[PDB]
Design a protein around this ligand. Structure first.
Ligand SMILES: Nc1ncnc2c1ncn2[C@@H]1O[C@H](COP(=O)(O)OP(=O)(O)OP(=O)(O)O)[C@@H](O)[C@H]1O
Lengths: 66, 104
């Protein structure tokens, strides 16, 4: 192997984009006007993309409960 | 529309299998009517964990019926044995009238 590449944990801006897209995938979701993806990413540091997947599905379920 | 069956005059043929949802516990307590080992009936208001887990199955079932697919999985763990987690699984299954697939 000449050189290599490593996929470090996603960054806050990466998280903003990824959360937006993941919500989009289950387009059925919606969000309050005040809640903005950029604001959302600030408190989801050190999460793997699969972690964000499971978190968004859990959130979808949580909404379904109420 | 109706009809009578007599073994000495009527023949019966088993055929392929057909799906059908099982009745929810609310409409009947099959164990109680047939006097089996009736599974303890929780009062969801007093078993919050059971309520939380149930709050998963019907939502998944509806979203599936509403055309929304989602792989809802859950794992039970505990610090001590003999807590009947399997019992609560069975209780939840009968509560929603859902088929159970138990594999020891
Ligand atoms: N409220 C209750 N909660 C749990 N089990 C109960 C309850 N009331 C009666 N039981 C009985 O207790 C037993 C529970 O056994 P079960 O195998 O489900 O336990 P478990 O928590 O999975 O434990 P383990 O796997 O360590 O044996 C069953 O025989 C069930 O009928």
């Amino acid at each position: 192997v000449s050189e290599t590449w490593s996929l470090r944990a996603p960054d806050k801006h990466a998280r903003a984009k990824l959360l937006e897209y993941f919500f989009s995938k289950n387009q059925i979701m919606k969000l309050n006007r005040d809640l903005q993806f950029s604001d959302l990413s600030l408190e989801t540091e050190g999460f793997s993309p699969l972690d964000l997947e499971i978190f968004t599905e859990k959130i979808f379920y949580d909404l379904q409960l109420e | 529309s109706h009809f009578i069956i007599d073994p000495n005059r009527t023949k019966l043929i088993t055929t392929n299998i057909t799906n059908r949802r099982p009745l929810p516990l609310s409409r009947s307590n099959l164990q109680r009517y047939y006097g089996f080992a009736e599974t303890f009936y929780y009062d969801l208001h007093i078993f919050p964990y059971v309520r939380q887990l149930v709050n998963i199955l019907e939502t998944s079932f509806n979203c599936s019926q509403r055309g929304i697919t989602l792989n809802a999985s859950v794992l039970l763990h505990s610090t001590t044995n003999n807590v009947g987690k399997a019992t609560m699984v069975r209780f939840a299954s009968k509560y929603l009238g859902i088929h159970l697939l138990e594999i020891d």
